[PDB]
Amino acid sequence: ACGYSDRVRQITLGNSTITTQEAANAIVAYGEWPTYINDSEANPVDAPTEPDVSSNRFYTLESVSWKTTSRGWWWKLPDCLKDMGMFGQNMYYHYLGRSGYTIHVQCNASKFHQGALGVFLIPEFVMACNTESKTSYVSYINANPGERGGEFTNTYNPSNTDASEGRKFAALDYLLGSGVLAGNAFVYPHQIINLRTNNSATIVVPYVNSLVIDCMAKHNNWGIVILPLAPLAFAATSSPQVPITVTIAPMCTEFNGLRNITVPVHQ
Amino acid sequence: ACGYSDRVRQITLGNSTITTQEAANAIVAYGEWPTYINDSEANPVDAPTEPDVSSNRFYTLESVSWKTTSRGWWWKLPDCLKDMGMFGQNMYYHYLGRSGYTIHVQCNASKFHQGALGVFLIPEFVMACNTESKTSYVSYINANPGERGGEFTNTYNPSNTDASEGRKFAALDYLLGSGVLAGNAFVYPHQIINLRTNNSATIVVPYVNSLVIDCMAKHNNWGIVILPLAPLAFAATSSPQVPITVTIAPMCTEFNGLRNITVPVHQ
Amino acid sequence: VSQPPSTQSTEATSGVNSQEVPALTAVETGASGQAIPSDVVETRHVVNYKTRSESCLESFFGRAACVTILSLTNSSKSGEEKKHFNIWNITYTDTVQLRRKLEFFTYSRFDLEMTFVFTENYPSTASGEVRNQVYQIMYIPPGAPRPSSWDDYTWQSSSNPSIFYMYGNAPPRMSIPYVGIANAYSHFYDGFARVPLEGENTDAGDTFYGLVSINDFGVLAVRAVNRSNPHTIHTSVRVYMKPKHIRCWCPRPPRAVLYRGEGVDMISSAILPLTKVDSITTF
Amino acid sequence: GAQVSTQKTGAHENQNVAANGSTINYTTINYYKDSASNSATRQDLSQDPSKFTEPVKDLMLKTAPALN
Amino acid sequence: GAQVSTQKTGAHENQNVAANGSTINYTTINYYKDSASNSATRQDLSQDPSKFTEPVKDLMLKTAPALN
Numbered sequence A, B: 001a002c003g004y005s006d007r008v009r010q011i012t013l014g015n016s017t018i019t020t021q022e023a024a025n026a027i028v029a030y031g032e033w034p035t036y037i038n039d040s041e042a043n044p045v046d047a048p049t050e051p052d053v054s055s056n057r058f059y060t061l062e063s064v065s066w067k068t069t070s071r072g073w074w075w076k077l078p079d080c081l082k083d084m085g086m087f088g089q090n091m092y093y094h095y096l097g098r099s100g101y102t103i104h105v106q107c108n109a110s111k112f113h114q115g116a117l118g119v120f121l122i123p124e125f126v127m128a129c130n131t132e133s134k135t136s137y138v139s140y141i142n143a144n145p146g147e148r149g150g151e152f153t154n155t156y157n158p159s160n161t162d163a164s165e166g167r168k169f170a171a172l173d174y175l176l177g178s179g180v181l182a183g184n185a186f187v188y189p190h191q192i193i194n195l196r197t198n199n200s201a202t203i204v205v206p207y208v209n210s211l212v213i214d215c216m217a218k219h220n221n222w223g224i225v226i227l228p229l230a231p232l233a234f235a236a237t238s239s240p241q242v243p244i245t246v247t248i249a250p251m252c253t254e255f256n257g258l259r260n261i262t263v264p265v266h267q
Numbered sequence C: 001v002s003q004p005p006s007t008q009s010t011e012a013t014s015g016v017n018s019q020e021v022p023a024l025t026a027v028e029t030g031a032s033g034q035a036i037p038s039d040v041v042e043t044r045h046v047v048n049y050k051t052r053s054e055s056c057l058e059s060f061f062g063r064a065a066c067v068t069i070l071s072l073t074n075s076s077k078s079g080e081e082k083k084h085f086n087i088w089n090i091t092y093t094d095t096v097q098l099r100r101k102l103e104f105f106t107y108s109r110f111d112l113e114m115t116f117v118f119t120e121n122y123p124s125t126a127s128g129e130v131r132n133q134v135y136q137i138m139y140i141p142p143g144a145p146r147p148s149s150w151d152d153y154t155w156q157s158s159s160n161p162s163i164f165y166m167y168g169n170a171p172p173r174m175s176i177p178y179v180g181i182a183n184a185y186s187h188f189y190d191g192f193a194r195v196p197l198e199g200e201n202t203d204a205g206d207t208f209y210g211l212v213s214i215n216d217f218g219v220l221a222v223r224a225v226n227r228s229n230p231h232t233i234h235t236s237v238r239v240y241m242k243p244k245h246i247r248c249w250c251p252r253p254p255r256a257v258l259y260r261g262e263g264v265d266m267i268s269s270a271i272l273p274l275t276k277v278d279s280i281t282t283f
Numbered sequence D, E: 001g002a003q004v005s006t007q008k009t010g011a012h013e014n015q016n017v018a019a020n021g022s023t024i025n026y027t028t029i030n031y032y033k034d035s036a037s038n039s040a041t042r043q044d045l046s047q048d049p050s051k052f053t054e055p056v057k058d059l060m061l062k063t064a065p066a067l068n
């Protein structure tokens, strides 16, 4: 080729375009690409709404910061987008929604930094609640943070008494807050942003569920988790910091069951 | 036929359906039906968003009331829908929007009532301001009432002083508030709901403009006006009243120029 | 006649000195390591006949695992009527062996083979006489009326599928279709049974979150059909599940720590799977 | 309505080749109207480890630079 | 005297098409001289909802005026 590097890559959807001159290929979850519901697999009989460009584009979440103390981060699809432009509107005005996404995790440093982020895309990412007084005790509000998403910790201190600390996930990093060694989180579609190698991560994911289309406002198909498999490090300070940005783009979105808009409980 | 009456008629769009057992045919504005922008007529180069069912359906406006005193009513497309479900969202998230609609004016009475409403659909419905101290003096807020729309009066009293009464249309009924005898408002696509004859009015209208697509948030292509050419009347009281309901449905809607959402000035 | 697929054989190879380096890679891509003997050392030719014939999901799940143990007591004493029967909630979370295996996959789809084993014994010194026992297992799907007493009209089973065992006979067993109301069985569920709207508790949901909040397969109402005898008798019925004609999707890591409840939930008491090793250089 | 099939090579059996004698045939006759009642589905050794070990978009071959 | 027939598509079964493999065949051999002794009669999905939902004399078609 004319030097078509495996590192350089461009992505486009709607009126949005990502670029990256240091990526490490890109992966397509389970080898399947986003598709629409085929007349033989359909369920809802009403004519679907397929937003196309208006909603199938690149929405960028508020960046977070990687510190030597950082323990990890997490988000939920479609949740962490429920407020993203047009996509959201459609998501909330419809009972049933279906979608796949292209996840692009960014994080540049310098040839003098060290660090390695494990970007995993886990389907049906259910975490344990923080209270050994109850089970599956998590409030909707806490389960669905949105653009902010959660963070992982390295300690487990349940509040059996304080019932307002129980109603939230116990994001235990070395166990994915699921009760499974993170060391095997690789059996999930993933990429690793090793600073000395790349600065981007691109993971295209197809809708996944025991159903064709589901109700987004209740269920988060995917869960995005980023754990520093290698701690950030800089020769200079002993308190280095680098931004990590997450840009998601839905694809092949279609909805059924249109009514008045959904507005969930909030604070 | 199996008795396919010119009176009975059904209409369907999206998940909405109108019916009427006493209509008087239906008219298609200027003889043309709603269409999309053809590759040879296009202007904006970005891939358009065509909502289809999500927005091209039957939205019903708050009914008004026909009184022996009633002088008339008016509304503006797309304005009087800017808040209607999904259509609105798309309308406001995009710089450019294009659409045609199916207008269905309802108003049933009884074989013992009298009355005749002239339902006109006027393109570029510009009315005079209420203040002879200024010209074309109308505030955005007043020009765009929405679901409520305005009302016609039979008197003209400009407020040259009070500048908050000038910034509004001078809805003079016998002149369409335009300075033209309403008697000739028929050179516009229209139907007449004569109570002793029908109880519905159906007028399908295609996009109309000196451009292919325009900016909805600034411009109202059509204007719906209803004038009692024949005063409501009932043998019983001398204060009869009957509801008039307006259900509009956009069609072949497409938008270009997606960005952050538009939120106009309000009170 | 056909030949089962064998695991990669080893073709003989030798030296090398090329710009072809199978040894190096970049796992950042998300792709696992691929190298094999041939790529790294000099190999001999080896004809492999062995097959992963036993790792086939159907083989891996091909066992009647015990899922629960129900108890009930046919007694003639005052408050021993509610004891004359029992209602079990259908699920595999009652134990941990089978559960963990299924838990290897996010979704699964299969037919089920139920097998029941009854074992009766004498409680106190009421070691007297009692005729032979005849039990009844009645499947009560979600929505069907449940037994009030060990003998109210419900045990007619004009529609509910019921087994009738005559203690001493072969362990009754039966088959069940894939009954899920989904296109597959969901093993996990990152969602809530319903959507809590604007004006509600700032905690709403904590009650209805987790697969458990949406899944429901009904219950098994067991009982002895005989009447109460002088001496009280105690029976223990064990439920066995073998998922057959199976297939699963999306692999996930195995449950590493003890199970708390039906959900993922962990207990601070036991969350140290691994084991301290003297040194990183301790063989 | 019976269907004969090949058995699973045993102890003193056909060279792994499972192609020696009819003495390795077992008969099967489904007795119930509902498929669910049938024995374990036939052993299927098909597999595509790649959807897990290499779901990468652009394909890379061993001998090449993983990162070009 | 045995009669083979198609089973009821199960879990991991033929695409609903019930037209995939002889592995969906069940055999039946009536053993008694009296029909009454036989299993459930073969599933019959025929139906004429109209004798109940439309036993009207003159037929009317959806799209027309029910009362002409």
Ligand SMILES: CCCCCCCCCCCCCC(=O)O
Pocket (backbone or CB within 6 Å): C090, C091, C092, C112, C114, C137, C138, C139, C161, C162, C163, C174, C176, C179, C185, C217
């Ligand atoms: C007469 C006995 C009837 C037994 C009915 C059992 C219903 C089967 C439900 C499926 C349970 C296993 C599925 C799962 O939880 O993954």
Ligand SMILES: *C(=O)CCCCCCCCCCCCC
Pocket (backbone or CB within 6 Å): D001, D002, D029, D031, E002, E004, E027, E028, E029, E030
């Ligand atoms: C195909 O089935 C022809 C071979 C039949 C051989 C007889 C098998 C024994 C009877 C099978 C069960 C029938 C149950 C009614």
Ligand SMILES: *C(=O)CCCCCCCCCCCCC
Pocket (backbone or CB within 6 Å): E001, E002, E029, E031
């Ligand atoms: C048709 O019936 C030919 C196949 C016979 C196969 C043998 C089935 C076993 C015997 C059936 C019951 C006979 C009772 C006297």
Ligand SMILES: [Ca+2]
Pocket (backbone or CB within 6 Å): C006, C007, C008, C009, C047, C048, C049
């Ligand atoms: Ca081999």
